[PDB]
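Q: What changes when N74 is included in the input?
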Amino acid sequence: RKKEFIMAELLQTEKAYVRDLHECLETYLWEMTSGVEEIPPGILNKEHIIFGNIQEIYDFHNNIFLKELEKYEQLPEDVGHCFVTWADKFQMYVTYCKNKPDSNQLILEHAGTFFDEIQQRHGLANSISSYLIKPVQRVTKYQLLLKELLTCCEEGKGELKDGLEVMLSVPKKANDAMH
Amino acid sequence: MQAIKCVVVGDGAVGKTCLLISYTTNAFPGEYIPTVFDNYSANVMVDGKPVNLGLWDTAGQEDYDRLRPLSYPQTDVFLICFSLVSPASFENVRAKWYPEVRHHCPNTPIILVGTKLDLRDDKDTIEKLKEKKLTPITYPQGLAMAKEIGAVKYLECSALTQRGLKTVFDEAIRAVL
Ligand SMILES: Cc1cc(NC(=O)Nc2cnn(Cc3ccccc3)c2)no1
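A: The predicted holo structure follows.
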């Protein structure tokens, strides 16, 4: 029963993470690239700095990772292998984290209220900053979920250890990549 | 209507996630304690004047000293938390949490929160501590730590009983208004 609640949460939160990145890309990013609106010269053509590689992070989750996590729904004790299989894709969070301080200052020093007006107009509870921290949050959370699976799965559960290993290595490598 | 970013920091032993869930849902989660609390916002009225309260969790980031501060800029108020039945978490307020929060946000108000108030009088918890030559953290210890860090308030709560819990968040908002 506990392994099931943890798997359910893994999945429900993966879906929400996918929905959150999708909203970020289709509201805040789309207003920059669209050509529907006046973009401060401070940030013009600087969407690569603002959003880092979040598009590529989203494509991973939305094209691959969520569909594969779904396949492990009845195999919670095996889900660490999902992370092992896709370890290389998670390397993009290293790039994302590296960039995030540059992202935040750019929005601070140069965007004025561009993104706040987008938020108001779209009626979003979350600000561009709230959305842009999410990848940092999500990549440090997988290891918590796996640890919880370790507390309630048998010794046929090094299909968690190796997963957790990867999911501890990624955020550490991201952390160590910062200035 | 005024927007308030509140970041919750502190050791894994505080139960940060459980705090925020108990606060926002009006109940200890009991059955299963979720590991994920996503950035949250809601309208509350404090001292009449309505406010939009934003809550961010940081659970999972306890070992990543350079990722933690990605959440710090433009925070209006921090909750620096420790668990009343973990002396090590209380000392980390001083050793870990306060220094980084000050370093990045020198003029942002801090509320010092002791969680797990319901465990401070629990025989098993007390005995488990006695076996390590330790005791729970008492009220004057919190006040003194609060002075030492510049905290505007020291507050004690339980996610389990709800005791002092709604007050924590009222006071976070008052520290901004
Ligand atoms: C963040 C926080 C926690 C808290 N007070 C607690 O957690 N209290 C507490 C912890 N264990 N128990 C027994 C238990 C545990 C889980 C499920 C059912 C029963 C009682 N106050 O703040």
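Observations recorded in class: Chain A has one domain: 1-179.
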